[PDB]
Write a protein that binds this DNA or RNA. Structure first.
Ligand code: NA
Ligand code: NA
Length: 327
DNA sequence: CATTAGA
DNA sequence: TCTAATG
């Protein structure tokens, strides 16, 4: 956690590189597992050999470990950090909609900069066009102060269309958090669950609403169960217009809400820990349900959940407020 | 690890 | 269809 830090850190650096710049999933996979193990290792790695003893720890990585242990650096590291082609990839990749594939392709063509980006908007798909379009706004955190206003808003329409709709803004936001990256709205309806063959309009209705009043400005992706968009707080009695924010709303089978809700709310560690627990308590949890465990090794049978509580109860735990769902 | 675009 | 990108 700190005794192994650099090693791991250099390692992930390395790893991450092969993966995006090059296309060496393998090596990329090497660094990672090695990075994973040294990470665990209960003592100060004093040399490559020492390290080497490890699982997934090769001779190549031992080597890098020594140079790094000896000199507070790595050449390949330095060489990479410098590398413009590499540097460029790392960067394009910031635009919502650009990934390693497209990033490398763009370089090869020569778009290494944001401007290049613009000159070449034709060479960009709608997602990417907006990614670039709200680039600034997109990299900006969301003050809870604004979250609250947004929330207030969605909840109002959600309701206005059909009073049946159940909406929850999950995420850190929910967990009390001061700021947030984007707003995640968990959505379900009673007339929709596991079986009842969809109802696409179910999502479509609210999107249309939201857009109706201008909270939604754009559509990244809109499918029958997941809408990826862009919203914005009405820029008041001008002077201060609001940044364009990422927004996601997913339709859900009422029968699997709180599981989902439980989950999306996290934290990533809370979940695990919670998950790790249900297992002892003779269970299994996952993004949609919770099933009793049968000693045959495994077992099915989705228990019925009416709220975050049921789930707790089941695994017989202390209801932990979203606030303390930290770990 | 599942959902959407797109080509 | 497969393959990318997002979460
Ligand atoms: Na990106
Ligand atoms: Na393949």
């Amino acid at each position: 956690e700190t005794l192994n830090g650099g090693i791991t850190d250099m390692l992930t650096e390395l790893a991450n590189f092969e993966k995006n710049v090059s296309q060496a999933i393998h090596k990329y996979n090497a660094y990672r597992k090695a990075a994973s193990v040294i990470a665990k290792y209960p003592h100060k790695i004093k040399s490559g050999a020492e390290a080497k003893k490890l699982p997934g720890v090769g001779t190549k990585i031992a080597e890098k470990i020594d140079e790094f242990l000896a000199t507070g650096k790595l050449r390949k590291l330095e060489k990479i950090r410098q590398d413009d082609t590499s540097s460029s990839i790392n960067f394009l990749t910031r635009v919502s909609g650009i990934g390693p594939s497209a990033a490398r392709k763009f370089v090869d063509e020569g778009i290494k900069t944001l401007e290049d980006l613009r000159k070449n908007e034709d060479k960009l798909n709608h997602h990417q066009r907006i990614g670039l379009k709200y680039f600034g706004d997109f990299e900006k955190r969301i003050p809870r102060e604004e979250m609250l206003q947004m929330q207030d808003i969605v909840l109002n329409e959600v309701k206005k269309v059909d009073s049946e709709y159940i909406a929850t803004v999950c995420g850190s936001f929910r967990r009390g958090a001061e700021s947030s990256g984007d707003m995640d709205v968990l959505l379900t309806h009673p007339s929709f669950t596991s079986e009842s063959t969809k109802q696409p309009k179910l999502l479509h209705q609210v999107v249309e609403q939201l857009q109706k009043v201008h909270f939604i400005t754009d559509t990244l992706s809109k499918g029958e169960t997941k809408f990826m968009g862009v919203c914005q707080l009405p820029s008041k009695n001008d002077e201060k217009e609001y940044p364009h924010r990422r927004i996601d709303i997913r339709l859900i089978p009422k029968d699997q809400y709180y599981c989902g809700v439980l989950y999306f709310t996290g934290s990533d560690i809370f979940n695990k820990n919670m998950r790790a627990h249900a297992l002892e308590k003779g269970f299994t949890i996952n993004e949609y349900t919770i099933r009793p465990l049968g000693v045959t090794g495994v077992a099915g049978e989705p228990l019925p959940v009416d709220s975050e509580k049921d789930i707790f109860d089941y695994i017989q735990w202390k209801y932990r407020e979203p606030k303390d769902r930290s770990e």
